[PDB]
Design a protein around this ligand. Structure first.
Ligand SMILES: [Zn+2]
Ligand SMILES: [Zn+2]
Lengths: 46, 146, 49, 107
């Protein structure tokens, strides 16, 4: 099995290393999003 | 009635209880439809091994975990797609195996919390995450080598 | 309750079997963690400490 | 069918509204009116069996055929062998000779 196609190059970036957070809603399906919901406040501690 | 504010059926993959009138994929076909079928970009999430095949460059170390933060920018490896659905990731002298993780069906979004100021921050919605990949060391090849 | 049901399972028979438990829970007005902890403590034996 | 609210993921019940019955949550004011028919069947198991038994063809699911019974000495037979005896070292026989409906039952 030769790697004939899709020799994807993997690059690394450190611009948003400490500023990237992964949020997920276990109760909200992926079909409906919170784009139309007007966000009011986001209180977070470093 | 609002088309986006309907009820929620238990099956997340089949939330369409009322209308106006999925088979398990594979990483090779996933990349094929991501690149060959269309040129549209997509945000993905992948799990990587705790230890990478490399030494932290002047990072003040004890054979600890070589995290991604210790590495620098630039090309670090190549994603290879072989025949018969074989998919690997070369990260130097070793090749890890890449497979599909748990198929999430709820809302997984990728955002960046950029704290530009001590009391002011800009949260940027990068996008939505649909698939999850997992990379694992190929212990069989390493044992067959030595 | 949706997260609890997802943790239990997504099979139709599983939800049909777990329905009575959700109904009995909804009989009372327990909807927060504090109320559930209060109920449990009310149901806790006296250790005599 | 169990339905959940998008607001808090709690259980939805049916409640009579000012204009139409609707699904509502006991924690949030989120409501969803009913427009057309919404059904949820169960399809229970039907007793498809007839419960017929005792046929001579199904009864003769035995090994012993053309032996000599100690009662009428005729070929037909229906033997049972038991080994559940420790005080009595030998085994145990139970013969059922029945062609003309004799009903032979002994040890
Ligand atoms: Zn609700
Ligand atoms: Zn006989």
């Amino acid at each position: 099995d030769d790697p004939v196609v899709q020799e994807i190059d993997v690059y690394l970036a450190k611009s948003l290393a400490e500023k990237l957070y992964l949020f997920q809603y276990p109760v909200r399906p992926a079909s409906m999003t919170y784009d139309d919901i007007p966000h009011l406040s986001a209180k977070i501690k470093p | 009635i609002i088309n986006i504010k309907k009820e929620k059926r238990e099956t997340d993959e089949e939330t369409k209880q009322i209308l106006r009138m999925l088979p398990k994929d594979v990483s090779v076909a996933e990349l094929l439809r991501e690149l060959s079928l269309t040129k549209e970009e997509e945000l993905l999430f992948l799990q990587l091994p705790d230890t990478l095949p490399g030494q932290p460059p002047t990072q003040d170390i004890a054979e600890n975990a070589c995290t991604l933060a210790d590495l620098t920018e630039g090309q670090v490896g190549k994603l290879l797609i072989r025949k018969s659905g074989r998919v690997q990731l070369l990260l130097g002298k070793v090749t890890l195996d890449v497979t599909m993780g748990t198929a999430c069906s709820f809302l997984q979004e990728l955002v960046s919390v950029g704290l530009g100021d001590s009391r002011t921050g800009e949260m940027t919605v990068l996008g939505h995450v649909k698939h999850k990949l997992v990379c694992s060391p190929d212990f069989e090849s390493l044992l067959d080598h030595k | 309750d949706q997260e609890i049901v997802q943790m239990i399972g997504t099979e139709e028979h599983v939800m049909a079997a777990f329905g009575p438990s959700l109904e009995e829970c909804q009989k009372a007005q327990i909807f927060t963690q504090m109320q559930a902890l209060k109920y449990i403590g009310n149901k806790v034996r006296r250790q005599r400490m | 069918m169990l339905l959940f609210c998008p607001g808090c993921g709690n259980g939805l019940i049916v409640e009579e509204g000012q204009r139409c019955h609707r699904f509502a949550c006991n924690t949030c004011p989120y409501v969803h009116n009913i427009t057309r028919k919404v059904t949820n069947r169960k399809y229970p198991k039907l007793k498809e069996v007839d419960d017929v038994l005792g046929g001579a063809a199904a009864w003769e699911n035995v090994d012993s055929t053309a032996e000599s019974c100690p009662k009428c000495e005729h070929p037909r037979a229906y033997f049972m062998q038991l080994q559940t005896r420790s005080a009595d070292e030998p085994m145990t026989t139970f013969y059922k000779c029945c062609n003309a409906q004799c009903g032979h039952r002994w040890r």
